[PDB]
Amino acid sequence: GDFLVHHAIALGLHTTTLILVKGALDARGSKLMPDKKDFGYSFPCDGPGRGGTCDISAWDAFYLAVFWMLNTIG
Amino acid sequence: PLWFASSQSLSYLDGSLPGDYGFDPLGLSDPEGTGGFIEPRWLAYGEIINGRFAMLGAAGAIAPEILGKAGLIPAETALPWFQTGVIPPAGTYTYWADNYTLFVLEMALMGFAEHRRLQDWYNPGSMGKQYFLGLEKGLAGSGNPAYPGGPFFNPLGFGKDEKSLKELKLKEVKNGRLAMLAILGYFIQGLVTGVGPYQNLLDHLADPVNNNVLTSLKF
Amino acid sequence: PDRPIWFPGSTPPEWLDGSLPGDFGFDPLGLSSDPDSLKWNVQAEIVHCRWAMLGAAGIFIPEFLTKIGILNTPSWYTAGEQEYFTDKTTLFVVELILIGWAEGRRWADIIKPGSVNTDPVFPNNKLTGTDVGYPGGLWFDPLGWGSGSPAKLKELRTKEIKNGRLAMLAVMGAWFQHIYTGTGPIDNLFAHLADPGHATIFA
Amino acid sequence: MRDLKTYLSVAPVISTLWFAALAGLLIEINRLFPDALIFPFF
Amino acid sequence: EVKILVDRDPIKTSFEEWAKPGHFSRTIAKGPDTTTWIWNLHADAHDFDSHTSDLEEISRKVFSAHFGQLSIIFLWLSGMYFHGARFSNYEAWLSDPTHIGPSAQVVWSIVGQEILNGDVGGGFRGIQITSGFFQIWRASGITSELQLYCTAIGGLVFAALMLFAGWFHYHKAAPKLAWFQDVESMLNHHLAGLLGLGSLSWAGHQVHVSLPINQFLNAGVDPKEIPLPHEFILNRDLLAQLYPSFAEGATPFFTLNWSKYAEFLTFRGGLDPVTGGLWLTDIAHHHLAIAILFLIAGHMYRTNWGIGHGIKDILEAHKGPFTGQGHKGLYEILTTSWHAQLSINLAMLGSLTIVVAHHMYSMPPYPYLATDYGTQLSLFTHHMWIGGFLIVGAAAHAAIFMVRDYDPTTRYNDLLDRVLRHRDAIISHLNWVCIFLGFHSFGLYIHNDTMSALGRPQDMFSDTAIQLQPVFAQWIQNTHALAPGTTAPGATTSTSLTWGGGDLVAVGGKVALLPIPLGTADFLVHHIHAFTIHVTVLILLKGVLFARSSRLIPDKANLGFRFPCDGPGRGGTCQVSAWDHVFLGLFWMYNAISVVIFHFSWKMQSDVWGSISDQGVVTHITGGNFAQSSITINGWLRDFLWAQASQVIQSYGSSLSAYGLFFLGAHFVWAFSLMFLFSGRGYWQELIESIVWAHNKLKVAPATQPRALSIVQGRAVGVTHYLLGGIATTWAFFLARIIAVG
Amino acid sequence: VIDEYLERSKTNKELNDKKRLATSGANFARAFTVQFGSCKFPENFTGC
Ligand code: CLA
Ligand code: CLA
Ligand code: CLA
Ligand code: CLA
Ligand SMILES: CC(/C=C/C=C(C)/C=C/[C@@]12O[C@]1(C)C[C@@H](O)CC2(C)C)=C\C=C\C=C(C)\C=C\C=C(C)\C=C\[C@@]12O[C@]1(C)C[C@@H](O)CC2(C)C
Ligand code: SF4
């Protein structure tokens, strides 16, 4: 009974780490927006162009990882 | 002579058809907007065919009863048209073969005839080309689908003159309409009264006031 | 062009010309629009015709001879149930290998028209056929009735094709009659001929 | 025939045929061998 | 004038258009550049108004789609009848309907799912069905399986006929535009022909077939000894022995002395004691009267002859105090666009479905239907959900029309302009009403909870401390109870047993119907219902009215109907389209319907359903705890959610186990929906970039470059998953409880 | 309803439940026919 729970805990840790690491590494720029560092740490979006860019900042990455942290601790 | 003619009906009914009294309240034969089975020519062709079949049926549904009452046919054979096996719940008779076998044979022969008729209707002269045991010479047709003519269909050579042909066509159309009405009357009388049409006629001639539509429906 | 067709007064399809033997322009579903499909269908039809002719003969001869007192062979439907000198699986395997060799040779002939005309073991023996589906040679045409004028060849091919179609219909009729009624085909024929009216499918 | 064959090669049709065949084979295998938890052939 | 107009072979049937996907739109037909193309190919498939601009092609496509839908429906009906005929225990259930549970599905024996074949009864094992088909078949007079087989064959034939008709009317003879624009003839034929004649024929069937067979069954005769239905038609002696009026024939009908037919055309009302349903004679009488009414009403509009009415003349010649000139150009608007008609019909159908559910639960029309609780619950919930969905769709189509088919130059209407000129007051008043209703309705519950949690049960709004009684509803109930005594002398008893006053009806030891009391809890729940309905109406109306333009965005009509936003400027303009308003109102419709079904289930289990002993006492399923436990949220959570979920979670290892599995699965789906409602596209695109790099390293890069879903697609996926999960959870819980306990 | 059909049902009360049980058993066995042994791979042709 502990095997599956331990693997679920590992899955939660891995997913939260993935979200936070991607948010930290892709902060300065990416292909969708190569000048992300000019706008700042927190900004709403970059408009509907290029197919739509919502939740593009790193503040949104922390925002999304909070839920996974809560679920893992639960 | 116009019967219930309207302004719309008189536009396309030019009188160049047998039995044209200009009666068409619903505009079914209206010239434009034609497709599928609704067309000015197909309706006339179907009317002619239905009239001919109705004449045949009207003669045949009454001949056996007349012969039986006159004593010219065995009694076990003279039956009302609904007791000959057409409606098994109403009655049945024993023939030389099973009823469904008779239906299969009739369907085969009628399909053989009607497919050729339809192929004439589609292609006018195509039915006189392929080998049909030599009978294909006489099935060429005259170009009019409703009146093919030829040795097989007009052996007696009637209607050579155009005026006589028109008179005969008018007579045929009127007789076909009368026979269709008679067949509908046969159906309704058989459904309501429950006895043969000749029996109804004899009962009415016996006492005109005692036997009528009100008698069967009382009041 | 002016040949008789299946439905008089109709227009035969464009991909059916009439050069092929037994051509009547009957293809309402358009199953052979592609030429390769036409070749494959022709080969399949020829093979089916020959196999069904053999099957119809082997079904209807022993039954008729059993109706008379000459033979005592059992019913064709119960032939596989009986016991033989070997298990059915062994006979099936041997037949599978034997027929598979010949079917592989025929497939190689179909794919490439002229690659299997020589005897692999002895190079002296050859097959004289020049048309796909008609192997010819001394093995499959010892009497020499095959090669000849194009008109006679077409007439013979049409005869064979029509006989094969009739045989296919015969075998399927025998199968369905046996499963439905439950008696030999000769018995059904005699019973129907005795009373043509009542003794029919509607019974 | 060419257009029908081209249509039959579209993604959803090929996918449904492949998955139906796979499901049938798996169901038949599980029917012939009812239960299986370890590999016992060795 | 009225005429038949068709075009011959407008299109040619070929498979060349099947090979190339997306032939309807040139942009789609060009080819797939990215994956988004695929997601578009299914989105624009049925948007006929965008493929072209001619009305004729759109009308023809609509006609063909209707024919295909009819064919599919006929196939479904044929399948249901075939399942009833072959794999069912209908013949066993016919003899003992009270002690046997209906079942029409049998599960295979591949994996171990054979535990799903429960002991329904009558020497049969299978899944218990709740469609209510057995009661329909019994009320129709079916007593064998050959008739069901024949019905299935006929359904198959009719489905094939419908498919062929659709093909013929699209590819061989397609009607012209003037054919569809003739609304008077269509209305005449739909009123007199489709409705009146069908109901007349059904009344004739009931008179000739259903009544004698049902009378024989109710007498106690074995189903295998009942004469066949055609024997009643053939043998007049049997009908004379049953109903002597038939001995007189059809003479009374023409004699106008119709009282002689009083034996099988009655006006008693109430429920039948033997079966716990409405009298079949009353049903036949009602069908006959409805047929007469529809046949009379079908000759109102002028078509091809002098007599009749013109719809345009009726609309234009209308004068009133508040209206004025009013309806002048509405005829052209209604006969020009399909979307307005679609919205009107959708709203009417939803309202009719809700009314149908209410009338069906109140007065059971089928024999042995009231005593089968699962069937009643399933029918009520299903019809409520269908009505809610249709009502939601009506507003979306109204917004679509207002966006893309409205021009005030060529086709101008005064009423629409007047409404559009003062939308702010309407929105403000609706907002205030919603706020007030919500505040009062929920504050009552919160006050009750707080007072009960502080040891103050004398300060709550309850039947014992502070009473808020529905006086108007009680007055209406008393009036309805006293109705047949003086106001309706023709009826022997009242229409329904729901009205306070009368007797109790029970069939086979189980309660069928009894009067329903009304108290403070009903008051509170009714006000909650009104609040939810008002909020949904506010959302939909705000979406519809502000579709063309707004104070924030003065040119919203140029962007279209389905656009995500306008930009990050103006402070933020997310979710400004009417599509977003519909997507938001779906949630509130779901909430309202869930609350309604919960209220209905708890009230019916607590105050109506139950069992009766021989002495005469009635024991209800939950023992009447609704009136004291439903006034607080804690009571709703504990006495309904916690108490009634015992059966679903304990169903493992039994024949109901499947339900339990669903009770988990739906939950999962619900949570899944959150992933599509809390996030955005940029994160997923940036992750797919790294995934695509990892693919590129190993030479497995596809030509169709993967792309994250669009914003509208994500919102649609989220709302679809949310609704599906919630509805499946409720379905599993309701079915498990009502099958294990009832 | 004329009490003659009721008397017929009383006289033939037996074997009617037997027919009902046989029909229900056949309806159930329509799914387990292959697992029972009958209607195996042979004779499925135009069968069951
Ligand atoms: C939302 C509705 C709501 C309502 C109506 C009530 C009502 C009530 N509460 Mg509850 N309560 C609520 C929610 C609500 N509560 C909530 C959310 C909480 C927090 C959990 C509480 C917690 C609570 C506590 C702790 C207590 C109460 C108690 C009471 C009573 C005290 C009333 C009072 O003293 O002030 C009324 C004051 C007024 C000034 C009335 C204003 C309204 C007037 C009449 C306006 C009408 C407008 C008019 C039509 C205008 C027309 C103009 C025209 C003439 C031109 C009252 C029955 C008390 C109790 O003991 O009662 C037994 C108590 O101690 N409540
Ligand atoms: C087209 C393919 C074809 C196929 C697959 C078969 C298949 C078969 N044939 Mg048929 N047959 C065919 C065409 C075909 N036949 C044709 C064209 C004819 C006309 C000449 C016959 C005439 C025929 C006869 C006369 C007999 C069979 C028999 C057999 C059956 C088993 C024997 C065996 O196959 O050896 C090849 C079979 C033959 C070509 C003839 C030789 C007879 C074999 C060797 C069996 C003799 C065994 C004996 C009768 C059984 C008991 C033995 C005893 C010691 C107790 C088997 C169903 C035999 C049988 O009925 O067994 C059930 C049999 O007696 N067939
Ligand atoms: C009465 C019938 C009806 C009809 C004919 C239409 C017709 C139309 N609608 Mg309307 N609509 C209706 C009712 C109807 N609607 C209702 C009840 C609602 C409320 C939900 C809506 C809400 C609505 C919206 C929000 C939109 C339309 C639009 C459209 C157009 C595009 C259709 C489309 O492309 O879908 C083709 C089909 C699909 C995309 C399939 C989607 C998958 C569905 C959602 C899944 C359901 C799953 C199933 C039930 C659960 C089982 C799961 C299993 C499969 C595993 C079309 C003209 C669209 C438009 O662009 O208009 C201009 C549009 O945006 N409609
Ligand atoms: C359960 C949580 C929840 C709650 C409480 C609300 C609440 C509300 N919604 Mg929201 N909503 C939610 C979830 C929720 N929503 C979700 C999941 C969605 C889907 C996206 C939406 C989408 C949505 C839409 C689309 C709309 C709303 C609207 C509204 C308002 C309706 C008007 C009204 O009833 O106000 C009355 C107040 C209440 C019911 C809230 C509870 C108040 C209680 C009684 C406490 C009061 C106590 C006291 C005053 C507190 C003082 C203590 C302090 C001093 C310490 C209200 C503010 C509608 C709107 O705003 O129009 C008016 C609207 O159009 N909502
Ligand atoms: C073909 C036919 C009957 C054929 C019967 C046959 C072969 C019977 C054969 C048998 O009996 C035998 C020999 C012997 C028996 O043992 C067996 C049977 C089989 C029983 C009837 C047609 C019968 C046809 C009928 C009655 C048609 C009526 C049409 C009408 C009234 C149309 C009216 C209008 O169309 C107009 C003219 C103009 C429009 O503007 C307005 C409206 C009103 C639409
Ligand atoms: S919908 Fe997305 S892109 Fe548009 S404004 Fe909102 S956050 Fe920005």
CSV table of N, CA, C and O in Angstrom, one decimal, chain E residues 648-704:
chain,number,residue,atom,x,y,z
E,648,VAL,N,-23.9,3.8,-3.1
E,648,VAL,CA,-23.0,3.8,-4.3
E,648,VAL,C,-21.6,3.4,-4.0
E,648,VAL,O,-21.0,2.7,-4.7
E,649,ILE,N,-21.1,3.8,-2.8
E,649,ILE,CA,-19.8,3.4,-2.4
E,649,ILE,C,-19.6,2.0,-1.9
E,649,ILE,O,-18.5,1.5,-1.8
E,650,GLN,N,-20.7,1.4,-1.5
E,650,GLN,CA,-20.7,0.0,-1.0
E,650,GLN,C,-21.2,-1.0,-2.1
E,650,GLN,O,-21.5,-2.2,-1.7
E,651,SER,N,-21.3,-0.6,-3.4
E,651,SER,CA,-21.8,-1.5,-4.4
E,651,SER,C,-20.7,-2.4,-5.0
E,651,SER,O,-21.1,-3.1,-6.0
E,652,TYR,N,-19.5,-2.4,-4.5
E,652,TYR,CA,-18.5,-3.2,-5.1
E,652,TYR,C,-18.8,-4.7,-4.8
E,652,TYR,O,-19.2,-5.0,-3.7
E,653,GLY,N,-18.5,-5.5,-5.8
E,653,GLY,CA,-18.7,-6.9,-5.7
E,653,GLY,C,-20.1,-7.4,-6.0
E,653,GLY,O,-20.4,-8.6,-5.9
E,654,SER,N,-21.0,-6.5,-6.4
E,654,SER,CA,-22.4,-6.8,-6.6
E,654,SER,C,-22.7,-6.4,-8.1
E,654,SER,O,-21.9,-6.1,-8.9
E,655,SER,N,-24.0,-6.5,-8.4
E,655,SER,CA,-24.5,-6.2,-9.8
E,655,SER,C,-24.5,-4.8,-10.1
E,655,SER,O,-24.6,-4.4,-11.3
E,656,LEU,N,-24.5,-3.9,-9.1
E,656,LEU,CA,-24.5,-2.5,-9.2
E,656,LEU,C,-23.0,-1.9,-9.3
E,656,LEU,O,-22.9,-0.7,-9.4
E,657,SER,N,-22.0,-2.7,-9.2
E,657,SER,CA,-20.6,-2.3,-9.1
E,657,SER,C,-20.3,-1.3,-10.2
E,657,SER,O,-19.6,-0.3,-10.0
E,658,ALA,N,-20.8,-1.5,-11.4
E,658,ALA,CA,-20.5,-0.6,-12.5
E,658,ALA,C,-20.8,0.8,-12.2
E,658,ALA,O,-20.0,1.8,-12.4
E,659,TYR,N,-22.0,1.1,-11.6
E,659,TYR,CA,-22.4,2.4,-11.2
E,659,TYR,C,-21.3,3.0,-10.3
E,659,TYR,O,-20.9,4.2,-10.5
E,660,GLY,N,-20.9,2.3,-9.3
E,660,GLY,CA,-19.8,2.8,-8.4
E,660,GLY,C,-18.6,3.2,-9.2
E,660,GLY,O,-18.0,4.3,-8.9
E,661,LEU,N,-18.2,2.4,-10.1
E,661,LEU,CA,-17.0,2.8,-11.0
E,661,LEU,C,-17.3,4.1,-11.6
E,661,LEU,O,-16.4,5.0,-11.6
E,662,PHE,N,-18.4,4.3,-12.2
E,662,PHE,CA,-18.8,5.6,-12.8
E,662,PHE,C,-18.7,6.7,-11.8
E,662,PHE,O,-18.2,7.8,-12.1
E,663,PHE,N,-19.2,6.4,-10.6
E,663,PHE,CA,-19.1,7.5,-9.5
E,663,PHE,C,-17.7,7.9,-9.3
E,663,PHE,O,-17.5,9.1,-8.8
E,664,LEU,N,-16.7,7.1,-9.6
E,664,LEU,CA,-15.4,7.6,-9.5
E,664,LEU,C,-14.9,8.2,-10.8
E,664,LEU,O,-14.4,9.4,-10.8
E,665,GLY,N,-15.2,7.6,-11.9
E,665,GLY,CA,-14.7,8.1,-13.2
E,665,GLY,C,-15.1,9.5,-13.5
E,665,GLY,O,-14.2,10.3,-13.8
E,666,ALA,N,-16.4,9.8,-13.4
E,666,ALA,CA,-16.9,11.1,-13.6
E,666,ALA,C,-16.1,12.2,-12.8
E,666,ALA,O,-15.6,13.2,-13.3
E,667,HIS,N,-15.9,11.8,-11.5
E,667,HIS,CA,-15.1,12.7,-10.6
E,667,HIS,C,-13.8,13.1,-11.3
E,667,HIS,O,-13.4,14.3,-11.4
E,668,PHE,N,-13.0,12.1,-11.8
E,668,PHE,CA,-11.8,12.3,-12.4
E,668,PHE,C,-11.9,13.3,-13.6
E,668,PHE,O,-11.2,14.4,-13.6
E,669,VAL,N,-12.9,13.1,-14.4
E,669,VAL,CA,-13.1,14.0,-15.6
E,669,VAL,C,-13.3,15.4,-15.1
E,669,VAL,O,-12.8,16.3,-15.7
E,670,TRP,N,-14.1,15.6,-14.0
E,670,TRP,CA,-14.4,16.9,-13.5
E,670,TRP,C,-13.1,17.6,-13.2
E,670,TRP,O,-12.8,18.7,-13.7
E,671,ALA,N,-12.2,16.9,-12.4
E,671,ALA,CA,-10.9,17.5,-12.1
E,671,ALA,C,-10.1,17.9,-13.3
E,671,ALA,O,-9.5,18.9,-13.4
E,672,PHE,N,-10.2,17.0,-14.3
E,672,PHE,CA,-9.4,17.2,-15.6
E,672,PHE,C,-9.8,18.5,-16.2
E,672,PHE,O,-9.0,19.3,-16.7
E,673,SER,N,-11.1,18.8,-16.1
E,673,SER,CA,-11.6,20.1,-16.7
E,673,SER,C,-10.9,21.3,-16.2
E,673,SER,O,-10.6,22.3,-16.9
E,674,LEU,N,-10.5,21.2,-14.9
E,674,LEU,CA,-9.9,22.4,-14.3
E,674,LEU,C,-8.6,22.7,-15.0
E,674,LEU,O,-8.2,23.9,-15.2
E,675,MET,N,-7.8,21.7,-15.5
E,675,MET,CA,-6.6,22.0,-16.2
E,675,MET,C,-6.8,22.9,-17.4
E,675,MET,O,-5.9,23.7,-17.8
E,676,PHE,N,-8.0,22.9,-18.1
E,676,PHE,CA,-8.3,23.7,-19.2
E,676,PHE,C,-8.9,25.0,-18.9
E,676,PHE,O,-9.1,25.8,-19.8
E,677,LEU,N,-9.2,25.3,-17.6
E,677,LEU,CA,-9.9,26.5,-17.2
E,677,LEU,C,-9.1,27.4,-16.4
E,677,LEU,O,-9.5,28.6,-16.2
E,678,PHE,N,-7.9,27.0,-15.9
E,678,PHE,CA,-7.1,27.8,-15.0
E,678,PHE,C,-5.8,28.3,-15.6
E,678,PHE,O,-5.1,29.1,-15.0
E,679,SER,N,-5.5,27.8,-16.9
E,679,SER,CA,-4.2,28.1,-17.5
E,679,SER,C,-4.3,28.8,-18.8
E,679,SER,O,-5.4,29.2,-19.2
E,680,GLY,N,-3.2,29.0,-19.5
E,680,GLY,CA,-3.2,29.7,-20.8
E,680,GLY,C,-2.3,29.0,-21.8
E,680,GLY,O,-1.7,28.0,-21.5
E,681,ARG,N,-2.4,29.6,-23.0
E,681,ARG,CA,-1.7,28.9,-24.2
E,681,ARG,C,-0.2,29.1,-24.2
E,681,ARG,O,0.5,28.2,-24.7
E,682,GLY,N,0.3,30.2,-23.7
E,682,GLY,CA,1.7,30.4,-23.9
E,682,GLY,C,2.6,29.4,-23.2
E,682,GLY,O,3.6,29.0,-23.7
E,683,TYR,N,2.2,29.0,-22.0
E,683,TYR,CA,3.0,28.0,-21.2
E,683,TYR,C,3.1,26.7,-22.0
E,683,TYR,O,4.1,26.1,-22.2
E,684,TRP,N,1.9,26.3,-22.6
E,684,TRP,CA,1.9,25.0,-23.3
E,684,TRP,C,2.7,25.1,-24.6
E,684,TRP,O,3.4,24.2,-25.0
E,685,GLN,N,2.6,26.3,-25.3
E,685,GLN,CA,3.4,26.4,-26.5
E,685,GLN,C,4.9,26.4,-26.2
E,685,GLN,O,5.7,25.8,-26.9
E,686,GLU,N,5.3,27.0,-25.1
E,686,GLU,CA,6.7,27.0,-24.7
E,686,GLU,C,7.2,25.7,-24.3
E,686,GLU,O,8.4,25.3,-24.6
E,687,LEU,N,6.3,24.9,-23.7
E,687,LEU,CA,6.7,23.5,-23.4
E,687,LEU,C,6.8,22.6,-24.7
E,687,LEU,O,7.7,21.8,-24.8
E,688,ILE,N,5.8,22.8,-25.6
E,688,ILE,CA,5.9,22.0,-26.8
E,688,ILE,C,7.1,22.4,-27.7
E,688,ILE,O,7.6,21.6,-28.4
E,689,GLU,N,7.6,23.6,-27.5
E,689,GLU,CA,8.9,24.0,-28.2
E,689,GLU,C,10.0,23.1,-27.8
E,689,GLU,O,10.7,22.5,-28.6
E,690,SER,N,10.2,22.9,-26.5
E,690,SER,CA,11.3,22.0,-26.0
E,690,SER,C,11.0,20.5,-26.4
E,690,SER,O,11.9,19.8,-26.7
E,691,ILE,N,9.7,20.1,-26.3
E,691,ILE,CA,9.4,18.7,-26.7
E,691,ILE,C,9.7,18.5,-28.2
E,691,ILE,O,10.3,17.5,-28.6
E,692,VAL,N,9.5,19.5,-29.0
E,692,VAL,CA,9.8,19.5,-30.4
E,692,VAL,C,11.3,19.5,-30.7
E,692,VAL,O,11.7,18.8,-31.6
E,693,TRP,N,12.0,20.2,-29.9
E,693,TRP,CA,13.5,20.1,-30.0
E,693,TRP,C,14.0,18.7,-29.7
E,693,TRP,O,14.8,18.1,-30.4
E,694,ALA,N,13.5,18.1,-28.6
E,694,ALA,CA,13.8,16.8,-28.2
E,694,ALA,C,13.5,15.8,-29.3
E,694,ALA,O,14.2,14.8,-29.6
E,695,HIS,N,12.4,16.0,-30.0
E,695,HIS,CA,12.0,15.2,-31.2
E,695,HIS,C,13.0,15.4,-32.3
E,695,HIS,O,13.4,14.5,-33.0
E,696,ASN,N,13.3,16.7,-32.6
E,696,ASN,CA,14.2,17.0,-33.7
E,696,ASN,C,15.6,16.4,-33.6
E,696,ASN,O,16.2,16.0,-34.6
E,697,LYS,N,16.0,16.2,-32.3
E,697,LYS,CA,17.3,15.5,-32.1
E,697,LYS,C,17.4,14.1,-32.7
E,697,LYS,O,18.5,13.7,-33.1
E,698,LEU,N,16.3,13.4,-32.7
E,698,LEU,CA,16.2,12.0,-33.2
E,698,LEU,C,15.6,11.8,-34.5
E,698,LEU,O,15.3,10.7,-34.9
E,699,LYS,N,15.4,12.9,-35.3
E,699,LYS,CA,14.9,12.8,-36.7
E,699,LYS,C,13.5,12.2,-36.7
E,699,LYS,O,13.2,11.3,-37.5
E,700,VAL,N,12.6,12.6,-35.8
E,700,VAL,CA,11.2,12.1,-35.8
E,700,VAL,C,10.3,13.3,-35.9
E,700,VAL,O,9.2,13.3,-35.4
E,701,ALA,N,10.8,14.4,-36.5
E,701,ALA,CA,10.0,15.6,-36.6
E,701,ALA,C,8.9,15.5,-37.6
E,701,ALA,O,9.2,15.2,-38.8
E,702,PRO,N,7.6,15.7,-37.2
E,702,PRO,CA,6.5,15.7,-38.2
E,702,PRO,C,6.5,16.9,-39.1
E,702,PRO,O,6.9,18.0,-38.7
E,703,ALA,N,6.0,16.8,-40.3
E,703,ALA,CA,5.8,17.9,-41.2
E,703,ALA,C,4.8,18.9,-40.6
E,703,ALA,O,4.9,20.1,-40.7
E,704,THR,N,3.7,18.4,-40.1
E,704,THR,CA,2.6,19.2,-39.4
E,704,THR,C,3.2,19.6,-38.1
E,704,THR,O,3.2,18.8,-37.1
